[PDB]
């Protein structure tokens, strides 16, 4: 029961464009963007009065920063991670968080299995190539300048995280002839059947037998830096790394490191934790074999105004109805006071 009423506020923190959730919020929100890459750009009137917040991937969100906000009911994160939220704290405030899980699943599979066949085919490095003046005649240069192209059939695709997206790698890895086998602590048991997919228990398993490693694994406490000295040591001579989940999951020092003693063959990364820039400035600098996105696995046009809808329904369910009942995918309904 804080300071203000008359049809409640509801802030877009880290961006500038409202006009997907404009016609479904305009009766029940004032809408209003603050375009903040940090909680210091908020302005004054916001944190003393944001009933709701709309949020991508660019601001980080602590106890600090949440401790700030005065009349704050909601955090509605437009996408599927909330690792950029402190969700615990978050509900012990009283702020219900929430996600949109479901709009990139497919996207996200897919520019996932581009990657993986990009490192197989060479066919960006190989692009790449051409484009910096590469001079490709004899089928002695094809074999060279696409040098240590591969079979993908036989070859294990080892899976980490088989929660969502890792469900549609898998089925489309099938399909090429990878042999696929996966980790996954937090699901039950009976799905590697319902699936037809081989699931190992630990994860030095799976990084001992997989010819490819992909990441689709919830970043938290435990498997921050997941890879590292220690475990990339667990992997194959010549290992494929995809990571297209969160950038905290990899650290790229040992990464960098093993991309040039040759021990991983190549890495494709649309993900690499360490905001905006990277490739001029960060371990990665000259590190050979590396595919590198700006984050954009999730996007496309329809997914884009797929979960902004979804996003901008779940704050009217919020405003209007209750928390936590109306709301459809909150996430940390288990810290809320």
């Known amino acids: 029961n804080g300071p203000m ?6 802030a877009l923190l880290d961006g500038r464009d ?23 750009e908020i302005h004054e009137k916001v944190l003393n009065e944001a009933v709701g917040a709309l949020m991508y991937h660019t601001i980080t969100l602590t106890r600090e920063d949440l401790e700030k906000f005065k009349a704050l009911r909601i955090i509605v994160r437009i ?3 909330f690792d950029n939220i402190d969700i615990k704290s978050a509900g012990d405030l009283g702020i219900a968080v929430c996600n ?4 990139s699943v497919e996207e996200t599979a897919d520019s996932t299995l581009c990657h993986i066949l990009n490192l197989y085919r060479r066919t960006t490095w190989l692009h790449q190539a051409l484009r910096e003046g590469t001079r490709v005649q004899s089928v002695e240069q094809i074999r060279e300048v696409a040098s240590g192209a ?37 699901l039950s048991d009976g799905i590697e059947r319902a699936l037809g997919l081989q699931r190992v228990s630990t994860l030095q398993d799976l990084l001992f037998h997989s010819d490819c490693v992909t990441l689709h694994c919830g970043l938290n406490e435990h498997n921050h830096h997941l890879i590292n000295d220690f475990t990339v040591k667990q992997m194959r001579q010549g290992a494929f790394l995809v990571n297209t989940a969160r950038g905290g999951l990899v650290d790229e020092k040992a990464l960098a490191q093993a991309l040039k003693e040759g021990r991983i063959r190549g890495a494709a990364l649309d993900v690499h934790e360490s905001e905006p820039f990277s490739f001029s400035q960060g371990p990665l600098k000259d590190a050979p074999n590396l595919i590198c996105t700006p984050h954009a696995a999730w996007y496309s046009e329809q997914a884009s105004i797929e979960m902004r809808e979804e996003a901008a329904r779940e704050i009217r369910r919020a405003i209007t109805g209750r928390i936590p009942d109306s709301l459809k995918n909150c996430v940390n309904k288990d810290h809320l006071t």
Do not use: W
Request: aromatic share 8%; hydrophobic share 45%; with cysteine.
């Open 18 to 40: 409202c006009t997907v959730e404009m016609p479904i919020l305009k009766d029940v929100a004032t809408v209003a963007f603050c375009d903040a890459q940090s909680t210091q």
């Open 100 to 103: 949109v899980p479901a709009a």
């Open 79 to 81: 996408g599927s991670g």
């Open 150 to 186: 591969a079979r993908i059939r036989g070859e294990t695709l080892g899976i980490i995280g088989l929660e969502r997206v890792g469900q549609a790698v898998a089925l489309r890895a099938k399909a090429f002839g990878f042999n696929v086998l996966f980790y996954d602590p937090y």
């Open 5 to 10: 009423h008359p049809r409640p506020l509801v």
